[PDB]
Amino acid sequence: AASDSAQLKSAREDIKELLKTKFCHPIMVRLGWHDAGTYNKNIEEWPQRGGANGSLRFDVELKHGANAGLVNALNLLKPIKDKYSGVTYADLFQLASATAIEEAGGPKIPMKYGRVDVTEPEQCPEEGRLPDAGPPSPAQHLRDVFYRMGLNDKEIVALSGAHTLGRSRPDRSGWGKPETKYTKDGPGAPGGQSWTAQWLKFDNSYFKDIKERRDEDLLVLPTDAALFEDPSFKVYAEKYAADPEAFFKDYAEAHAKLSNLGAKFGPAEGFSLEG
Numbered sequence: 028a029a030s031d032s033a034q035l036k037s038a039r040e041d042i043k044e045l046l047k048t049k050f051c052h053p054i055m056v057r058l059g060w061h062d063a064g065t066y067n068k069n070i071e072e073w074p075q076r077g078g079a080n081g082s083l084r085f086d087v088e089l090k091h092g093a094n095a096g097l098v099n100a101l102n103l104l105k106p107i108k109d110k111y112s113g114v115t116y117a118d119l120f121q122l123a124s125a126t127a128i129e130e131a132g133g134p135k136i137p138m139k140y141g142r143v144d145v146t147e148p149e150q151c152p153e154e155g156r157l158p159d160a161g162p163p164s165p166a167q168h169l170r171d172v173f174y175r176m177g178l179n180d181k182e183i184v185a186l187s188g189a190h191t192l193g194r195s196r197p198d199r200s201g202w203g204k205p206e207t208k209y210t211k212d213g214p215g216a217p218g219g220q221s222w223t224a225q226w227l228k229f230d231n232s233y234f235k236d237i238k239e240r241r242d243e244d245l246l247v248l249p250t251d252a253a254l255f256e257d258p259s260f261k262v263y264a265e266k267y268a269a270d271p272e273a274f275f276k277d278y279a280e281a282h283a284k285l286s287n288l289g290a291k292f293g294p295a296e297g298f299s300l301e302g
């Protein structure tokens with residue numbers, strides 16, 4: 028009865044209702060990125076290459092250190108997933124993320140769907156393909172991880188801007204204060220430490236805050252700091268801090284690129300919902 032494209036649209040409606048009710052925009056963006064971020068451009072075969080294939084839905088991968096707390100996001104999406112047999116987790120994760128950015132006031136991401144789902148937890152990538160926030164050499168570590176995905180310096184800086192959304196919890200990743208004046212009252216579950224004052228608003232404030240460092244309640248990870256310390260990253264970081272339009276353009280394109288990493292589409296070229 029309902030076409031697969033129609034189901035994705037219905038799922039998007041459900042997601043928008045979920046975001047309006049739970050204020051869970053940030054975790055949805057993190058979920059999508061952690062499914063896609065395991066992509067390795069050097070591996071040819073699907074699903075060994077990792078990436079956007081819905082493997083992140085399995086306990087084995089959710090248990091990876093970098094994925095602490097993501098089971099909450101999966102659980103929030105499960106009820107929606109159950110309504111649509113024609114919607115894959117691979118697509119649902121990316122749909123929830125893109126919708127989250129947009130509902131949060133971000134740019135419209137040029138998205139395509141039709142991603143195929145892996146079927147067994149044995150197809151999940153091994154742990155260690157996602158970045159650490161506190162390595163000995165942050166900037167080089169970012170290159171090691173993102174260059175492997177086939178992403179460049181521009182994309183590394185632009186995508187890091189997603190930290191304008193959400194916060195860190197010492198009970199999850201281990202970073203951040205237990206709470207601050209900006210998070211102690213929610214909305215959603217209070218607590219943790221945000222990078223920006225309005226952590227439910229998608230704008231270029233992340234770049235301004237990590238550079239200014241005037242607010243002790245605002246978080247700055249070694250990898251965020253690397254954006255302004257690195258001779259190449261700083262070019263884009265300063266540009267985004269001063270040009271919100273430039274950030275939105277580069278962000279939309281980078282987010283779309285990330286969302287496709289390692290995926291196998293059906294049909295091969297995928298399909299659009301509003302093209």
Ligand code: HEM
Nearest residue numbers: 053054056057060158159160186189193194195196199200
């Ligand atoms: C540059 C490599 C990155 C590192 C080292 C990193 C690290 C972190 C850490 C430590 C947290 C705290 C999580 C917690 O407390 O539960 C976090 C949260 C988050 N990150 Fe990243 N991140 C990176 C890249 C990205 C990218 C590329 C995006 C998406 C375009 C992103 C989106 C988010 C979001 C939305 C949250 C907040 C989730 C929430 O509030 O529950 N991150 N990240």
Ligand code: NA
Nearest residue numbers: 062078080082
């Ligand atoms: Na995956």
Ligand code: NA
Nearest residue numbers: 191223225228
């Ligand atoms: Na923000």
